[PDB]
Design an enzyme around this catalytic site. Structure first.
Site, PDB file in Angstrom:
ATOM      1  N   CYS A   1      -0.938   9.659   3.597  1.00 31.67           N
ATOM      2  CA  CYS A   1      -0.661   9.507   2.365  1.00 31.67           C
ATOM      3  C   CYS A   1      -1.962   9.453   1.634  1.00 31.67           C
ATOM      4  O   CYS A   1      -1.765  10.014   0.610  1.00 31.67           O
ATOM      5  CB  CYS A   1      -0.530   7.544   2.513  1.00 31.67           C
ATOM      6  SG  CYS A   1      -2.116   6.858   4.092  1.00 31.67           S
TER       7      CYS A   1
ATOM      8  N   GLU B   1       0.639  -0.982  -0.101  1.00 30.15           N
ATOM      9  CA  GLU B   1      -0.018   0.266  -0.001  1.00 30.15           C
ATOM     10  C   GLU B   1       0.696   1.161   0.004  1.00 30.15           C
ATOM     11  O   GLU B   1       1.238   1.673   0.948  1.00 30.15           O
ATOM     12  CB  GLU B   1      -0.935   0.175   1.070  1.00 30.15           C
ATOM     13  CG  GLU B   1      -1.511  -0.963   0.762  1.00 30.15           C
ATOM     14  CD  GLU B   1      -2.831  -0.869   0.459  1.00 30.15           C
ATOM     15  OE1 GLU B   1      -3.710  -0.681  -0.014  1.00 30.15           O
ATOM     16  OE2 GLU B   1      -1.985  -2.193  -0.857  1.00 30.15           O
TER      17      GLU B   1
HETATM   18  N1  LIG Z   1      -1.316   3.351   0.734  1.00 33.43           N
HETATM   19  C1  LIG Z   1      -1.385   4.082   2.228  1.00 33.43           C
HETATM   20  O1  LIG Z   1      -2.334   3.543   2.890  1.00 33.43           O
HETATM   21  C2  LIG Z   1       0.110   4.679   2.932  1.00 33.43           C
HETATM   22  C3  LIG Z   1      -0.515   4.629   4.139  1.00 33.43           C
HETATM   23  C4  LIG Z   1       0.490   5.586   4.633  1.00 33.43           C
HETATM   24  C5  LIG Z   1       1.734   5.663   4.154  1.00 33.43           C
HETATM   25  N2  LIG Z   1       2.232   5.068   2.654  1.00 33.43           N
HETATM   26  C6  LIG Z   1       3.397   6.074   2.088  1.00 33.43           C
HETATM   27  O2  LIG Z   1       4.123   5.561   2.845  1.00 33.43           O
HETATM   28  C7  LIG Z   1       5.202   6.805   2.381  1.00 33.43           C
HETATM   29  C8  LIG Z   1       5.562   7.767   4.133  1.00 33.43           C
HETATM   30  O3  LIG Z   1       5.726   6.427   4.738  1.00 33.43           O
HETATM   31  P1  LIG Z   1       7.570   6.624   4.945  1.00 33.43           P
HETATM   32  O4  LIG Z   1       8.194   7.310   4.671  1.00 33.43           O
HETATM   33  O5  LIG Z   1       8.101   5.501   6.541  1.00 33.43           O
HETATM   34  O6  LIG Z   1       8.115   5.377   4.225  1.00 33.43           O
HETATM   35  P2  LIG Z   1       9.139   4.015   3.033  1.00 33.43           P
HETATM   36  O7  LIG Z   1       9.215   3.302   1.485  1.00 33.43           O
HETATM   37  O8  LIG Z   1      10.163   5.437   3.601  1.00 33.43           O
HETATM   38  O9  LIG Z   1       9.470   3.039   4.422  1.00 33.43           O
HETATM   39  C9  LIG Z   1       8.358   2.490   4.982  1.00 33.43           C
HETATM   40  C10 LIG Z   1       9.103   1.376   6.148  1.00 33.43           C
HETATM   41  O10 LIG Z   1       9.720   0.205   4.833  1.00 33.43           O
HETATM   42  C11 LIG Z   1      10.568  -0.153   5.097  1.00 33.43           C
HETATM   43  N3  LIG Z   1      12.066   0.077   4.441  1.00 33.43           N
HETATM   44  C12 LIG Z   1      12.980   1.271   3.551  1.00 33.43           C
HETATM   45  N4  LIG Z   1      13.982   0.453   2.894  1.00 33.43           N
HETATM   46  C13 LIG Z   1      13.504  -0.747   2.480  1.00 33.43           C
HETATM   47  C14 LIG Z   1      13.380  -2.026   1.978  1.00 33.43           C
HETATM   48  N5  LIG Z   1      14.568  -1.447   0.387  1.00 33.43           N
HETATM   49  N6  LIG Z   1      12.900  -2.983   2.376  1.00 33.43           N
HETATM   50  C15 LIG Z   1      12.598  -2.835   2.653  1.00 33.43           C
HETATM   51  N7  LIG Z   1      11.742  -1.701   3.922  1.00 33.43           N
HETATM   52  C16 LIG Z   1      12.523  -0.831   4.026  1.00 33.43           C
HETATM   53  C17 LIG Z   1      11.442   1.333   6.113  1.00 33.43           C
HETATM   54  O11 LIG Z   1      12.298   1.385   7.227  1.00 33.43           O
HETATM   55  C18 LIG Z   1      10.257   1.358   6.366  1.00 33.43           C
HETATM   56  O12 LIG Z   1       9.328   0.717   7.715  1.00 33.43           O
HETATM   57  C19 LIG Z   1       4.538   7.470   1.323  1.00 33.43           C
HETATM   58  O13 LIG Z   1       5.278   7.377   0.119  1.00 33.43           O
HETATM   59  C20 LIG Z   1       3.374   7.431   2.119  1.00 33.43           C
HETATM   60  O14 LIG Z   1       2.631   8.072   0.779  1.00 33.43           O
HETATM   61  C21 LIG Z   1       0.715   4.686   2.201  1.00 33.43           C
END
Ligand SMILES: NC(=O)c1ccc[n+]([C@@H]2O[C@H](COP(=O)([O-])OP(=O)(O)OC[C@H]3O[C@@H](n4cnc5c(N)ncnc54)[C@H](O)[C@@H]3O)[C@@H](O)[C@H]2O)c1
Ligand SMILES: [C]C1=C([C])[C]=C2C(=[C]1)N([C][C]([O])[C]([O])[C]([O])[C]OP([O])(=O)OP([O])(=O)O[C][C]1O[C](N3[C]=NC4=C3N=[C]N=C4[N])[C]([O])[C]1[O])C1=NC(=O)[N]C(=O)C1=N2[C]1[C][N][C](C([O])=O)S1
Ligand SMILES: [Mg+2]
Lengths: 1217, 107, 54
Positions: free
Chosen positions: A828, A794
């Site tokens: 998001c 998501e």
């Molecule tokens: N569609 C939804 O319901 C929803 C909800 C909330 C946030 N978001 C999205 O989340 C983003 C913001 O949140 P964020 O900054 O924490 O996102 P992010 O992609 O920077 O990281 C999210 C998680 O992924 C992990 N991560 C980073 N690299 C990884 C890898 N190579 N492999 C596995 N895990 C990895 C991070 O540690 C973190 O726990 C925004 O793009 C927002 O739109 C979507």
């Protein structure tokens, strides 16, 4: 460095005993409020008989002179349907926007009457909901503008200029003389002489309210000031009882009139009221403070107190104040006011009303999950309250001046006899609304009647300014429980109208019971589950207790550790700093080594059978216990979220509520579905984002756990502490340590977990780019059964809101400010692109910029802070880089100034960027940055194309009153969460199941009924999940199969057609004043990668049954299996030699052995754009299992939330009294 | 048109009236794409005619008619099917297409 | 109004001229009455000076 929460929400003044008794009653159970009111309102049998006789006499006179309305006579004369009447009044409204009378008449005679009215930017029918109330008495929330256009053409072609003439003259009378006393204060004063000579008086209402900008408040201020001069000149020494006065609304005088901004209110609003009161004093006229929403009542008391104690106003008894008898605090508010009048020696003018905002108070309490309502829920309770409070006022006429504002003849008669025989002008008065009340009070005013004075509340303003007050007025007169509606109902006898509410309530079996058809907020979902509870940040007791709990939360030594199945693990430790002030150390995190992350997955695998063996009902019981624990701990959880994640208190409450709702929703969904054959996947890696650090964290883990999977929980590196506390709560709730391991750390820990051999499923919420890296990791992998590892990903949004010229600018601006800048845009769902119809763009942009500059940005441990920090310096740099790029291209950039205090943290000011084309945006910018584009109305369909063309599909908003535009836009937009006439950041679990398509998600939606089924090997049938509709192309394909002799596949195709839930269309239970819809659509174009003819036929049946088109892999060599397709099916079928060129796809079906599946999975993951939800099966599996491809994942969920109260009231609640 | 229905009388006059309840909030999606195409070509009068046809079309009307209890009597407007277009001019053809596409038809 | 008041006589003619039973002859006359009143009302709802006859 300021101590955390040391200045969170100090009250304006220490709360006196009398003030505290008000606050104590805020949401008191209805059964407790009524008994004292019944006692206070009791009168002697002689008086009740005399009152009933007086009320009967008034009602008989009212019904005797009750002639038909002008609109009713117009409808009759020209045999108009209701839609024709409404359309006619809309046309007349528009013709009256033409100022010159001769010009208007030429347009009517030469252009309008001669057919084509459409020829001569703004729908004629923008205000049709209001005219609908006038014509039909009923409120329709949106406008069927195509029905009205048809009706207008029909009535003009039938009746011509005469009916237009009569409509215009009717509209001119009503809008100039009936809805308002005059267009200007001078006109209103001229029209007041007639009734003043008969013994009436006036209180003029300049119709301002809800300032959105500083300029708005200034405009309303100078309107009041200029009116006071005109009224005071006209009063000419008549004084405050015989002479006219003015009424004001505090919400008109400051754009941030709220308890959260109490310091600004006392510093900025109060001096303005004082200046107006000083002028009213010099002319010796009344100045009344109108009563508004329940969460403004107690705040307004602080202004009333300061004004009545201000020696500069001494000598003047004209200060007035409204109290609302539908409010549970009303008698205690009166006790406070009467005491204030005694202390100050000011004879406060107290207008007792019942209350104008009832529907809105019901919705707001439900939305906020509060303990009870601040108003009564049975109309008769308000009536008893009114009479009880009138008794209190009539015992204090030496110190206050009671003003009984009501149109109810029974209420009036009861008070007339309660007040007794001694009367003098100045003892008390009645009051009524202009237009509405004169028939009744012409039977009251004058020595030939009851010889009691009546003050007329007299609206003054142009047609434009009159709308809001008008709908609030017209809705009142249309409610079944309203006196005005009942006295006009022939089926209502005079005996029923003079029935004594005091005695009726007194004889009820349960005195003061809540209305049976209004749900307490806790009971919104009935037997399904218990709604989470919020907190009332307008309640001083709540603010006081929250202040202490928040401070205590800041003294705690929060830690986050790698919590393996065997116990806490060692690792690298660092501090966690408040993003709004890096000097505020929130706690310490010990992060996980990649070795320990791999070990945790093996421990989860070894513990998987023991967790799967816990029966689903007991797993769900753990979730319910965890929800209770989070509800009890909410204040402490608030403090942690506020300081760790830069959230405001309001946002932290919603965050914890959402976590509670996930727990309870997935628990209930489990109890509805999971049985022995829905086996868990195995160890599930849950990777969560920083921005909803408790809610999404909890939601993913709770779903995986309750589906029987052990969980490896990897929280975002920015926000480990709240995650560790949520894991502590889940473990306390009974989740075994082996079933839920916490692995703090950065993306390396996430990646190590995803790559671990025993990882059976991945739940990811975060950026699209990171999801794409995880998708690539997983494409290397197959389950022990040789099938793809499920991934729920998501991801981001590029969320638009479209606003046309029928929307109300004030509503739009409030929803835009919230959607774009709440949480500093770090949702998001946040609004990224506002699209404004060209004809209204400048006015809305001006209002939006004005509202922008009223936002308070700072460290979020203060209730007055609207916008907190961005999470890191890196996020800040990324956002600012975008802003400066745009600024460098010459785009207009509006930013509010940041206080020097923000330098200790990482803040980005709320920003508005005016773009030329939507393609000026390239990627999601996760910060407080709103982009604005303009569009011409004819280009609406192209604009929807442009929104869809980004490839995102998460949230989408539309502000319009017009059904044609709703139908058009919602049928053409491709996004998972739609919002009509409201903000776009609602993701209420089970109400707006949340999740998008394209670059925004794979689905299934979190907080929806398909979610748990993705976390087991065999998906259950969700509650309510079925459809009676059969895709017609599927039917054509099944017939083609039968014609080709493929009898078994034709049968499988028909079975798929029946089993598909495509076309499911449900309304989900939720708050009043909203309609929350949930529908299953086609996903789009599904990539088919078959291996055999029968496999291809099964894949095509699955895809077509779910409404999809397909692109079939040309390398399969199966082209000859699909010869001579029906044209209907051929339209849905394409063959693809280059999958990357023929996307984007919305999913994939794959047939092959394990290594074929792995190879195809790698090729699919390499496709540009959206992550594809891939389903694979062997040829043998297709032969053996009719559900080899699960139809759940071949439809697309769409949630739509419609604010049905947007027109100014709630039609459903109009029938509830 | 159907006897005993609201379109009938309009066939018997030289300019048909708008019958009671005869409207639809739905806009044919192919009509919409056609209007945009006409926009792109600069055929502004025809694109306007297409948008006007899309709005005034009652395709998708879906009404319950008053009648006896124990029955639901429904009345709906669907596309006719495939319409034969016999144009003479390009503008004429665009107008014919707009009329047919707005009412859900193929041509 | 005239067909309603004369329905018994009209029934008799329809029964003997067109082979109808009494029930079907009643339905026949009722439908004629309904056509008359329906097209009258539809006229009152729609027709104006620009709706010229054929
Ligand atoms: N569609 C939804 O319901 C929803 C909800 C909330 C946030 N978001 C999205 O989340 C983003 C913001 O949140 P964020 O900054 O924490 O996102 P992010 O992609 O920077 O990281 C999210 C998680 O992924 C992990 N991560 C980073 N690299 C990884 C890898 N190579 N492999 C596995 N895990 C990895 C991070 O540690 C973190 O726990 C925004 O793009 C927002 O739109 C979507
Ligand atoms: C008269 C008047 C004056 C002079 C002034 C004012 C007023 C008035 N307001 C309004 C009021 O409040 C009301 O609303 C009205 O008036 C109505 O009442 P009456 O006449 O009394 O009637 P009845 O019918 O008897 O009653 C009604 C009521 O009731 C209630 N409910 C309903 N339902 C229900 C209820 N409750 C409970 N439950 C249920 N279910 C309600 O209340 C109704 O209404 C006013 N208001 C306010 O709030 N404030 C103020 O200030 C006032 N004033 C004015 C000003 N403002 C306003 C606006 O603007 O709108 S108006
Ligand atoms: Mg990151």
């Amino acid at each position: 460095a300021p101590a955390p929460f040391a200045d969170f929400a100090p009250p304006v003044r220490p709360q006196s005993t009398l003030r505290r008794a008000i606050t104590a009653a805020y949401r008191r159970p209805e059964t407790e409020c009524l008994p004292p009111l019944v006692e206070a309102a009791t009168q002697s049998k002689e008086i009740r008989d005399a009152a009933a006789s007086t009320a009967r006499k008034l009602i008989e006179a009212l019904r005797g002179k009750h002639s038909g309305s002008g609109v009713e006579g117009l409808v009759q004369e020209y045999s108009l349907s209701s839609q024709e009447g409404v359309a006619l009044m809309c046309l007349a409204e528009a013709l009256l926007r033409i100022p010159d009378t001769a010009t208007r008449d030429a347009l009517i005679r030469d252009k309008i009457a001669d057919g084509n009215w459409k020829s001569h930017s703004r729908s004629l029918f923008v205000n049709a909901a209001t005219w609908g109330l006038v014509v039909t008495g009923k409120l329709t929330s949106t406008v069927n503008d195509r029905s009205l256009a048809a009706a207008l053409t029909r009535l003009i072609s039938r009746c011509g200029e005469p009916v237009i003439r009569r409509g215009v003259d009717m509209a001119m009378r009503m809008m100039g003389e009936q809805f308002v006393t005059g267009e200007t204060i001078r006109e209103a004063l001229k029209r007041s002489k007639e009734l003043e000579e008969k013994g009436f008086s006036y209180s003029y209402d300049m119709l301002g309210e809800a300032a959105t900008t500083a300029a708005d408040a200034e405009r309303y201020y100078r309107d009041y000031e200029s009116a006071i001069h005109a009224i005071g000149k006209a009063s000419a020494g008549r004084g405050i009882y015989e002479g006219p006065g003015i009424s004001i609304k505090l919400s008109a005088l400051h754009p941030r009139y709220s308890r959260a901004q109490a310091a600004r209110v006392m510093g900025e609003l109060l001096p303005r009221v004082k200046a107006l009161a000083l002028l009213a004093k010099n002319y010796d006229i009344g100045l009344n403070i109108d009563a508004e929403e329940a969460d403004r009542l107690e705040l307004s008391l602080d202004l009333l107190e300061v004004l009545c104690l201000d020696g500069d106003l001494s000598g003047w008894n004209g200060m007035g104040f409204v109290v609302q008898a539908y409010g549970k605090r009303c008698p205690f508010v009166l006790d406070f006011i009467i005491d204030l009048a005694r202390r100050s020696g000011r004879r406060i003018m107290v207008r007792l009303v019942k209350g104008a905002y009832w529907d809105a108070e019901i919705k707001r309490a439900q939305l906020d999950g509060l303990a009870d309502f601040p108003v009564f829920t049975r109309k008769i309770h308000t009536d008893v309250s009114y009479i009880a409070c009138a008794a209190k006022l009539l015992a204090a006429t030496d110190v206050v001046f009671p003003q009984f504002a009501t149109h109810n003849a029974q209420t009036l008669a009861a008070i007339y006899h309660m007040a007794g025989k001694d009367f003098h002008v100045g003892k008390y008065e009645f009051q009524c609304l202009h237009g509405m009340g004169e028939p009744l009070y012409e039977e009251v005013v004058g020595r030939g009647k009851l010889d009691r004075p009546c003050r007329i509340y007299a609206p003054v303003g142009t047609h434009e300014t009159l709308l809001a007050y008008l709908v609030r007025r017209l809705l009142e007169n249309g409610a079944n429980s309203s006196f005005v509606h009942r006295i006009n109902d022939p089926k209502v006898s005079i005996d029923e109208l003079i029935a004594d509410p005091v005695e009726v309530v007194r004889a009820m079996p349960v005195v003061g019971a809540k209305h049976d058809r209004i749900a307490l907020p806790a009971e919104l979902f009935g037997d399904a589950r218990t709604n989470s509870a919020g907190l009332d940040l307008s309640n001083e007791e709540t603010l006081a207790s929250l202040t202490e709990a928040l401070r205590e939360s800041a003294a705690m030594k929060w830690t986050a550790l790698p919590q393996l199945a065997t116990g806490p693990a060692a690792g690298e430790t660092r501090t966690v700093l408040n993003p709004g002030d890096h000097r505020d150390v929130v706690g310490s995190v010990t992060e996980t080594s990649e070795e320990d992350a791999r070990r945790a997955v093996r421990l989860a695998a070894d513990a998987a059978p023991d967790w799967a063996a816990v029966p689903p009902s007991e797993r769900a019981a753990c979730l319910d216990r965890a929800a209770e624990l989070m509800q009890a701990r909410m204040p402490t959880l608030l403090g942690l979220i506020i300081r760790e994640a830069g959230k405001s208190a309001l946002n932290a409450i919603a965050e914890v509520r959402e976590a509670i709702d996930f727990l309870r929703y997935y628990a209930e969904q489990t109890r509805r579905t999971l049985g022995p054959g829905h086996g868990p996947l195995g160890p599930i890696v849950c990777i969560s984002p920083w921005n909803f650090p408790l809610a999404i964290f909890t939601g993913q883990i709770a779903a995986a756990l309750v589906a029987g999977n052990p969980v490896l929980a990897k929280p975002a590196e920015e926000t480990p502490l709240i995650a560790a506390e949520g894991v502590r709560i889940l473990r306390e709730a009974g989740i075994p340590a082996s079933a839920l391991q916490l692995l703090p750390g950065d993306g390396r820990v996430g990646a190590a977990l995803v790559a671990a051999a025993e990882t059976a499923g991945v739940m990811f919420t975060g950026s699209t780019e990171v999801a794409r890296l995880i998708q690539a990791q997983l494409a290397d992998r197959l389950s022990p059964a040789g099938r793809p590892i499920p991934l729920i990903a998501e991801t981001g949004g590029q969320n638009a809101m479209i606003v046309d010229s029928s929307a109300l600018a004030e509503q739009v601006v409030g929803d835009v400010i919230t959607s774009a800048f709440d949480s500093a845009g770090q949702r998001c769902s946040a609004l990224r692109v506002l699209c404004l119809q060209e004809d209204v763009a400048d006015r809305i942009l001006t209002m939006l910029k004005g509202a922008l500059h009223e936002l308070h940005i700072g460290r979020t441990d203060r209730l007055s802070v609207d916008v907190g920090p961005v999470i890191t310096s890196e996020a800040k740099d990324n956002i600012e880089k975008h802003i400066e790029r745009m600024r460098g291209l010459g785009r207009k950039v509006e930013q509010i100034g940041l206080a020097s205090e923000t330098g200790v943290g990482t803040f980005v000011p709320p920003t508005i960027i005016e773009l030329e084309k939507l393609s000026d945006l390239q990627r999601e910018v996760f910060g407080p940055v709103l982009h604005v584009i303009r569009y011409r109305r004819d280009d609406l369909d192209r604009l929807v194309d442009d929104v869809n063309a980004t490839g995102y599909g998460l949230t989408f908003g539309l502000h319009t009153r017009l059904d044609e535009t709703i139908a058009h836009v919602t049928s053409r937009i491709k996004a998972g969460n739609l919002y009509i006439n409201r903000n776009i950041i609602g993701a209420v679990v089970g109400v707006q199941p949340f999740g998008g398509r394209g670059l925004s998600g794979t689905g299934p939606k979190a907080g929806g009924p398909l979610y748990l089924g993705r976390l087991v090997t065999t998906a259950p049938v969700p509650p309510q999940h079925s459809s009676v509709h059969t895709d017609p192309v599927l039917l054509d394909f099944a017939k083609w199969l039968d014609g080709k002799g493929a009898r078994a596949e034709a049968e499988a195709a028909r079975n798929a057609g029946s089993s598909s839930a495509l076309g499911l269309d449900l309304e989900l239970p939720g708050p009043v004043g909203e309609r929350n819809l949930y529908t299953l659509h086609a996903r789009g174009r599904i990539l088919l990668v078959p291996a055999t003819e029968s496999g291809l036929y099964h894949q095509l049946a699955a895809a077509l049954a779910t409404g999809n088109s397909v692109a079939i892999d040309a390398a399969s060599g199966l082209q000859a299996s699909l010869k001579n397709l029906p044209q209907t099916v051929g339209l849905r079928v394409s063959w693809s030699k280059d999958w990357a060129a023929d996307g984007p796809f919305a999913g994939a079906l794959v047939e092959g052995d394990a290594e074929r599946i792995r190879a195809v999975n790698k090729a699919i993951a390499a496709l540009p754009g959206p992550l594809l939800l891939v389903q694979a099966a062997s040829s043998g599996e297709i032969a053996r299992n009719p559900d080899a491809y699960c139809l759940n994942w071949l439809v697309e969920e769409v949630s739509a939330s419609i604010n049905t109260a947007a027109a100014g009231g709630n039609a459903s609640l109009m029938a509830i009294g």
